Amino acid sequence: GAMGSMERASLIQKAKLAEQAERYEDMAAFMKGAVEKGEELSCEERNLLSVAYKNVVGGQRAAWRVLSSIEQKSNEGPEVREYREKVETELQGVCDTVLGLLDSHLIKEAGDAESRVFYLKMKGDYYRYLAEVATGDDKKRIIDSARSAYQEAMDISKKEMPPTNPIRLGLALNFSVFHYEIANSPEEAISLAKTTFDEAMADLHTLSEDSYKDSTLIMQLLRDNLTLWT
């Protein structure tokens, strides 16, 4: 595409530079170019792809929430709605771009549990971001697409990864947020966070000091949500 004339290794190097410079739009464009070279991604490369798009869409979501709040207060000229719609359309375009990379062809080529779970978690997340802005029409279908991606990732992670694996933990955290914030299922969110936390606690004894630090950091996020929800 736009990055078709740049070497894969140069795109990866530039994505790392863009991260250091906090240029996340550039980072995402470099990683899109790398994915479109057609080769599978290593663990580090998958993280670069996810970090780039999470930061781009995170800024869009924060702006959408500011504008949606102003619009709701205005509804209690067309400019606030028009501008919220502009940001919303841009956000949807970024989510569709990520989902398109996962569908062409990252997921189908991902055979190891670590890569397949990582990509299915991403698919759940980007459908979840689409669901946050969706209103009634395909809102149900978007929610089901998120749920289905998260569920397949959960099924694989429970069979193939230990309960302390950081991707398994982050998948459970984000699926619990999906249940609480999107699916109107706070009891399912609380149950998932509690079971995930407890099963990780029981497996910490198997870990090195560095892996212990990685796993306990995500467990604290599960605990923080449980404290907010209970």
């Binding site: 930061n55 955290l173 619990s176 914030e181 996020l221 929800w229």
Partner: peptide, 8 residues
């Protein structure tokens, strides 16, 4: 509710 954060 907090999801996995973006990197540092």
């Amino acid at each position: 509710a907090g999801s996995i954060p973006g990197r540092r």
